[PDB]
Amino acid sequence: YLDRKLLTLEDKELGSGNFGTVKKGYYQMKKVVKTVAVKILKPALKDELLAEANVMQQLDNPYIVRMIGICEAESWMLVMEMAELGPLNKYLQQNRHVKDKNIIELVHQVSMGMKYLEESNFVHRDLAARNVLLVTQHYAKISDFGLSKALRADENYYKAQKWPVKWYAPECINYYKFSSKSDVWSFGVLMWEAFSYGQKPYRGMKGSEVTAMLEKGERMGCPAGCPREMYDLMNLCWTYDVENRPGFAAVELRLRNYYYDVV
Amino acid sequence: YLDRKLLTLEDKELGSGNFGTVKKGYYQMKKVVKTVAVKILKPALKDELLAEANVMQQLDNPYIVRMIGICEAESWMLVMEMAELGPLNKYLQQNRHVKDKNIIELVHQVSMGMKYLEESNFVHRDLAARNVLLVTQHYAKISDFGLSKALRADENYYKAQKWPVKWYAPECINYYKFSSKSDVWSFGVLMWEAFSYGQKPYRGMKGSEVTAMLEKGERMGCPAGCPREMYDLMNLCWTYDVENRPGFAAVELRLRNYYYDVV
Numbered sequence: 001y002l003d004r005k006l007l008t009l010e011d012k013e014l015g016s017g018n019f020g021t022v023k024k025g026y027y028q029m030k031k032v033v034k035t036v037a038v039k040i041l042k043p044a045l046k047d048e049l050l051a052e053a054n055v056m057q058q059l060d061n062p063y064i065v066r067m068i069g070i071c072e073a074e075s076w077m078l079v080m081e082m083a084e085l086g087p088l089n090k091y092l093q094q095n096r097h098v099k100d101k102n103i104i105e106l107v108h109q110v111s112m113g114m115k116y117l118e119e120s121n122f123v124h125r126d127l128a129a130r131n132v133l134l135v136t137q138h139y140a141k142i143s144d145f146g147l148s149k150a151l152r153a154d155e156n157y158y159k160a161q162k163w164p165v166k167w168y169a170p171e172c173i174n175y176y177k178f179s180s181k182s183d184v185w186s187f188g189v190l191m192w193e194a195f196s197y198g199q200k201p202y203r204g205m206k207g208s209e210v211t212a213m214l215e216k217g218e219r220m221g222c223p224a225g226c227p228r229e230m231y232d233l234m235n236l237c238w239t240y241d242v243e244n245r246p247g248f249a250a251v252e253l254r255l256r257n258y259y260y261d262v263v
Numbered sequence: 264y265l266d267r268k269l270l271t272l273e274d275k276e277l278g279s280g281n282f283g284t285v286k287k288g289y290y291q292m293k294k295v296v297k298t299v300a301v302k303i304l305k306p307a308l309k310d311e312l313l314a315e316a317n318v319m320q321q322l323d324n325p326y327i328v329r330m331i332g333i334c335e336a337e338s339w340m341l342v343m344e345m346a347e348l349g350p351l352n353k354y355l356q357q358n359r360h361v362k363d364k365n366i367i368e369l370v371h372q373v374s375m376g377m378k379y380l381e382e383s384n385f386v387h388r389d390l391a392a393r394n395v396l397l398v399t400q401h402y403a404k405i406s407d408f409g410l411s412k413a414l415r416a417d418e419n420y421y422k423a424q425k426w427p428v429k430w431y432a433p434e435c436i437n438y439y440k441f442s443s444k445s446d447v448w449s450f451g452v453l454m455w456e457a458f459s460y461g462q463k464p465y466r467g468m469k470g471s472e473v474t475a476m477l478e479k480g481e482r483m484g485c486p487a488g489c490p491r492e493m494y495d496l497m498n499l500c501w502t503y504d505v506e507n508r509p510g511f512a513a514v515e516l517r518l519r520n521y522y523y524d525v526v
């Protein structure tokens with residue numbers, strides 16, 4: 001719990017959504033000030049914010065957004081370290097000449113953050129390019145832990161009882177079972193989005209039409225300019241059977257090796 | 264849920280639409296057989312049929328079509344009591360010498376079913392002459408509950424988030440708010456249709472042209488042979504401001520009194 005008197009909010013919002021707003025601010029530390037991004041709410045939303053903060057407080061990795069704390073003031077607030085360049089999909093939409101090697105670098109960083117999340121037995125459950133934030137053009141962090149779950153000690157998945165279904169694996173849709181392997185499927189969609197410079201996946205399609213396409217064995221095509229090896233990796237992430245899909249250790253290693261080849 | 268083996272369908276359809284098909288059939292009761300009309304579907308459509316059946320199961324009135332049940336078989340089916348003469352607009356198109364007193368009788372019956380729906384806090388949201396079905400030439404029932412909503416206990420309208428816009432009140436179009444008063448507006452259009460022997464309302468006009476006409480304060484003219492008192496009531500149903508428009512108790516009483524005057 002942070003001290004509201006140490007927090008300075010800017011008046012104009014960075015962004016807005018059904019949760020509320022995101023604002024830039026400053027948090028006074030022992031000497032330095034820290035630039036922060038602040039998620040500001042507005043029964044259930046408050047509980048969801050506290051749960052989101054509880055997940056983030058347990059994570060400690062360079063490729064994951066760091067929480068500073070929560071502040072209960074004029075509204076409920078989640079205060080995070082600022083990633084100044086914002087969401088990856090919007091950045092790539094606005095910066096269409098980012099080089100392929102740079103895209104590989106960023107998606108590999110996401111795969112390092114996810115390898116850590118997997119090792120930590122958390123499932124993200126909303127891994128999409130809008131939930132990757134850029135610190136610099138060469139440094140990506142995973143954000144947006146509002147759907148994330150800490151797995152039980154005795155289970156390798158979370159069983160659920162509006163979903164981002166274009167990012168969800170078949171077992172999520174058909175059995176409501178969310179595992180790190182389900183996050184690998186979403187990571188394949190994220191890769192497709194990144195190599196498509198922030199285009200929406202399954203353009204023009206309803207959720208039921210996506211389910212029907214995937215059940216036919218069909219997958220999105222290779223983005224313009226995307227290396228064959230990276231499209232091959234997207235397709236391995238989109239392995240239908242969860243038991244035969246790779247985990248993030250295998251995915252990160254493939255990306256790491258390909259990146260250092262291109263380098 | 265009904266027993267498919269107690270249901271016999273006829274091969275030839277009564278009608279078709281994007282909704283699927285309507286077929287005649289029979290449902291075996293304990294001794295008697297009941298003639299039924301069956302809506303047969305051709306994700307979203309199933310949910311919509313189940314919600315339609317859930318509305319109809321709660322309604323108990325002589326001027327509303329009775330549902331027998333749903334049947335999940337070769338397709339999803341909504342089984343209803345058969346109204347043998349079919350939709351009112353088509354019947355009047357084919358029977359142009361039905362007397363004015365008979366038209367008053369039938370629209371008064373519709374206003375009794377709607378007074379009940381209003382008392383039951385349901386909004387119909389598709390009240391049009393095609394959705395009035397004839398049991399006999401002197402007995403009308405309201406059908407077609409696929410857009411209908413049960414109002415929340417704390418609200419007197421449903422807020423929405425293709426529509427039959429020529430039947431919708433201005434608050435439906437401008438604020439997406441659907442109340443029993445909005446159904447009264449639609450009922451005025453239904454009256455116009457009935458006294459016009461099933462002609463389409465606002466003929467030759469696009470939706471935007473209808474909105475423009477109504478915003479000028481203009482309304483459809485009086486059908487040939489329609490009593491002035493009935494045109495007056497149509498125009499009261501087309502009161503622009505929802506708070507000044509009558510409810511169905513007032514509309515039914517006006518129709519009841521006029522009918523027994525003509526009787």
Ligand SMILES: CO[C@@H]1CN(Cc2cn(-c3ccnc(Nc4cnc5c(c4)c(C(=O)C4CC4)cn5C)n3)nc2C)C[C@@H]1O
Pocket residue numbers: 014015016017022037039065080081082083084085086087130131133143144145
């Ligand atoms: C609806 O968007 C979903 C929700 N989610 C919210 C969120 C942002 N968070 C954060 C954390 C650290 N840094 C930053 N930096 C940052 C910089 N510029 C920004 C934005 C964010 C920004 C937005 O967020 C616009 C999209 C709302 C717009 N601009 C220009 N954001 N954390 C969260 C939990 C982002 C994701 O896209």
Ligand SMILES: CO[C@@H]1CN(Cc2cn(-c3ccnc(Nc4cnc5c(c4)c(C(=O)C4CC4)cn5C)n3)nc2C)C[C@@H]1O
Pocket residue numbers: 277278279280282285300302328343344345346347348349350393394396406407408
């Ligand atoms: C597109 O049309 C809309 C949809 N809607 C469907 C509907 C009918 N339902 C029903 C219930 C009880 N009896 C009956 N009797 C009955 C008798 N003869 C009929 C028809 C119906 C008939 C049609 O329905 C043609 C229009 C398809 C044609 N013929 C000769 N129908 N219930 C529903 C929910 C009717 C409305 O006009």
